[PDB]
Amino acid sequence: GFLKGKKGLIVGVANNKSIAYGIAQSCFNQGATLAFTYLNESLEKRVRPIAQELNSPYVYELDVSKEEHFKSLYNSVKKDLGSLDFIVHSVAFAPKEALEGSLLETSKSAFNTAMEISVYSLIELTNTLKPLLNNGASVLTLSYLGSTKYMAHYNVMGLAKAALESAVRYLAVDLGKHHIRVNALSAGPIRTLASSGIADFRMILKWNEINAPLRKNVSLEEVGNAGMYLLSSLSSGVSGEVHFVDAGYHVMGMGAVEEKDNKATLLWDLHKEQ
Amino acid sequence: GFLKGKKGLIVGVANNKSIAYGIAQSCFNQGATLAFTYLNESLEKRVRPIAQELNSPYVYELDVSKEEHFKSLYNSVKKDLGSLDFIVHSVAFAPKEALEGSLLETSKSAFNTAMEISVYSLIELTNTLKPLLNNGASVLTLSYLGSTKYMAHYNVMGLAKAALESAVRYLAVDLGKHHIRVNALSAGPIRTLASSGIADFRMILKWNEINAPLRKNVSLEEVGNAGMYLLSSLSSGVSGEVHFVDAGYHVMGMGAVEEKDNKATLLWDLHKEQ
Amino acid sequence: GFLKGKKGLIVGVANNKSIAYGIAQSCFNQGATLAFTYLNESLEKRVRPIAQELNSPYVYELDVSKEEHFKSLYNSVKKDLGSLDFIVHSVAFAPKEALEGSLLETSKSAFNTAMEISVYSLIELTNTLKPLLNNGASVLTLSYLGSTKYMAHYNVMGLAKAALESAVRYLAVDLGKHHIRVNALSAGPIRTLASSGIADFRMILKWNEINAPLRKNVSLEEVGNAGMYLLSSLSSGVSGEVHFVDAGYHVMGMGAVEEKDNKATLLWDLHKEQ
Amino acid sequence: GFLKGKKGLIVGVANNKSIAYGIAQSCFNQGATLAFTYLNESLEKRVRPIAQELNSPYVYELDVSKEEHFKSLYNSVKKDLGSLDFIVHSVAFAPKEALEGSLLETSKSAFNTAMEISVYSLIELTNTLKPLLNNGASVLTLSYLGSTKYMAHYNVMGLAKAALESAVRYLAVDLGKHHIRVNALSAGPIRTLASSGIADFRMILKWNEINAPLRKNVSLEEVGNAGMYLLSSLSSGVSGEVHFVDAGYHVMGMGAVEEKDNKATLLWDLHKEQ
Numbered sequence A, B, C, D: 001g002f003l004k005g006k007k008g009l010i011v012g013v014a015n016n017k018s019i020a021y022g023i024a025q026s027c028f029n030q031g032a033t034l035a036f037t038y039l040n041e042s043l044e045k046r047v048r049p050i051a052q053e054l055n056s057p058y059v060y061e062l063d064v065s066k067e068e069h070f071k072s073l074y075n076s077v078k079k080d081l082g083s084l085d086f087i088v089h090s091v092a093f094a095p096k097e098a099l100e101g102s103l104l105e106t107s108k109s110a111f112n113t114a115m116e117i118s119v120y121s122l123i124e125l126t127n128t129l130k131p132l133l134n135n136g137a138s139v140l141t142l143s144y145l146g147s148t149k150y151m152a153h154y155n156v157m158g159l160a161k162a163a164l165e166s167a168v169r170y171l172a173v174d175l176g177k178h179h180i181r182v183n184a185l186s187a188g189p190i191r192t193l194a195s196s197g198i199a200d201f202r203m204i205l206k207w208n209e210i211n212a213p214l215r216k217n218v219s220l221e222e223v224g225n226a227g228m229y230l231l232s233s234l235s236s237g238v239s240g241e242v243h244f245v246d247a248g249y250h251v252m253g254m255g256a257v258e259e260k261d262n263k264a265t266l267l268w269d270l271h272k273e274q
Ligand SMILES: NC(=O)c1ccc[n+]([C@@H]2O[C@H](COP(=O)([O-])OP(=O)(O)OC[C@@H]3O[C@@H](n4cnc5c(N)ncnc54)[C@H](O)[C@@H]3O)[C@@H](O)[C@H]2O)c1
Pocket: D012, D013, D014, D015, D017, D018, D019, D020, D038, D039, D043, D062, D063, D064, D065, D090, D091, D092, D093, D117, D142, D143, D144, D186, D187, D188, D189, D190, D191, D192, D193, D194, D195
């Protein structure tokens, strides 16, 4: 496979539906040696089996808000794996209230929480593991259109993702000198533990399905394969990029109508509402 | 005014609803000395009165597909005005068929026409008048979101506008050395002779009205004022820019819902649709 | 003038070279009634005379890190001015260390400071004064190309500005319903108290001067005029926009060479370098 | 392999250094069945042996300026291959003069040639072969940063590439309904027959090498692998995207300096310039 002999750290798995899992799964089918981290002991209940399923005995605790965990992590992968060829950063969080209502109502606390867990953790994760990164290593994080466009009540996470993509660009210049790559995979809406916690997500999901050029929502496998590519040597010439895996949704300047042209009607007015 | 003493050429007026007219109107209110061009004698019937209305006796014939017209134009403005401080390029065309159906169906002839009238003409207009341009001169052209985003059946005009905005960047580097500025005003949908010729434009218009942040379509005056700004010394520090005057529509990543949050419903499903 | 009768709050004046002063100066020349805020008593020494210079007796204390100041600000402008037509948000801070070295070295504390002072403050400032904002009101903030592109050691401030422009988009949708506008002016490098504190800024400045299409650095007046425009009714059709006032620098995909074409040489290898 | 059993048409091979060959090579290593086209009999001298090297006996003549060639192409692939899974569009042309001097000097003829051969050909190629495209088929074309940013004397080809990326977006919507994907690979500068014909290309090449984050130019293999990915089911969730394979160069907002920070000096002033 394209990751045969390669060692990578997967941060962000919560269950078999996690985007991090889709990527880990695809990276595994490519021969990668994987190691996983979990936020707490409850999540570990799902991460461990998943790890074993992917031939991995390396499971470490990691709550990006606890700096001491980063210390242990360094020592852990350095002892178990010795070095890393790729890092998957699939983590983000903001209080439930922040994701509803307007950005205006956001509290200073919710803001900092969103930024620290969703943005700064990439810096700390990368800086902490930099010594263990081999040449050609690849760092991947996840983003969403909400960083550069308005998306229904994405609010503060929108500011976080925009900062995150900027961080991807600066990190690429900081680590590129060492031949290390950094990119962001901008996935289209998909059902996950975090997404199921978002208001009217079924609607955001329905909207993408109908208005996206490929007229369908992206699968966990498609996001996973896209991540695996970004992480492999297949994309050794790619860095600082925000790669879209959203069935082409990002290209839409408005609602689709294309199929019907009698008087041209919104695909939305025809399907998933009437 | 901000254009007092300044001399500009207005290319693109077809009637009192033309964007070029809005711009000319706003520039006039700022003390600008104006000159106008018309495609043919039928359009001249509307351009002349408008020109007189704006205290202008300089009306020249100009069909961008006829190179000889550019020769006469140079001689005309050089004799009547001696020099130009700003140029407004508000012209575009493509066969009716091209704007309906898909891009795939576009013929080679419709493609070339769209590109020559909507893009090359800016090059030839600018190159032809370059010797008559004073320092600080400002060249302005019009574009639409369809250049960088998909908009319903905009098809070939989308490729043209994209090229046009790229031309704006190259022309800014070419003329910037001579202290001349070049920009593109990306207007939101608005009723005009050319727009009225487009299929289901009422819908594209309705859609922008409901989904745009300011919840309304832009007025001709707002587009005009924006243009005047771009043309005046007020923006002497701006060049190679694509300025959006679309009630903020360009920031939308999807349909609006913001106002209603019970279950959060698409503002489209509530207004202009039910 | 275009701001005659209009009332604006200027946040960010440190001295006669602050971008906020340029904007205030330009807005003043347009008949605007102004009110200013200062971070502390040392800054107030410069803010007051400036305020008087601009015919303003409304000077308030405002350190965006102290929530109680926002309460007093509300009560103050509400008592002195009654309502606001525009808000100028020209504030940003980050520890000196963050702006040097790599992003990777940034501490969690510096990160939060950068984000809170430079981004969250726009949210709190706007939310606090929302009730005093009249219809058609305009909120303006300042950004830099470092948000979407890598700029020498801009680091964390780059992430901040990316988030800021994203905030401008979400705030525009939140406030657009109330006919209020929100934009960001992306100014080119310019000598200010804050800029003078940045390493090798003379170089970033020199580089923009030689490589920018208009071959020069932007003047405080140009930035001020651009701001005034964004804040006036002249731009009532503009919102959620990131307006570039950088002598067109943003369009450069590489170093300039355009003038000399023998073998084509980098303008940088010819000027300010030999 | 990821293209095992998949059938694709490679358009644009001139020799063993052509980007189309790098992609064909990578697609071949993935089990794809290939078919090639050549402009004329002189090019065929290089295409055939290459085709045989890639286990391909399907070599067809195709000059995108001759419509009748598209007719023959349809009949040829339909008889030899029956159907297509992916199309590679790696073709562009502009008179030598256009690529030097300014855009302002471009003639109407050079403009049309640049647009027709570099942009319209994708439309015609795709429309002609649409009936032979299986579901999940992928259409790939090549672009360059010069489409959205100014690149030294890229001129009219910059307008063309901008239009080409816009076309990719519209074609993605037109063909997405049929589950077909359309993308654009934006390669970094690389030595090819066409590039060798461009003025001071060694400099543009040198400039990317030193200023790109990965501090190196991209290899033909890297571009090939990126293309193969875009053409394979690995990217089934990607469409209408402009994928950058330029060692991360696109993220640079100015010349690099990062490594040296004493006073921070442009890497350009240190290497390939002294
Ligand atoms: N070389 C680079 O650094 C670079 C960078 C970005 C994009 N590209 C793009 O890659 C594509 C081609 O790649 P390349 O650099 O390998 O060029 P190349 O010289 O290897 O071949 C591309 C050419 O297109 C073909 N062509 C020209 N006119 C044609 C016509 N009328 N009909 C059919 N074919 C025609 C030529 O035969 C030749 O194969 C172009 O779109 C080019 O703009 C190249």
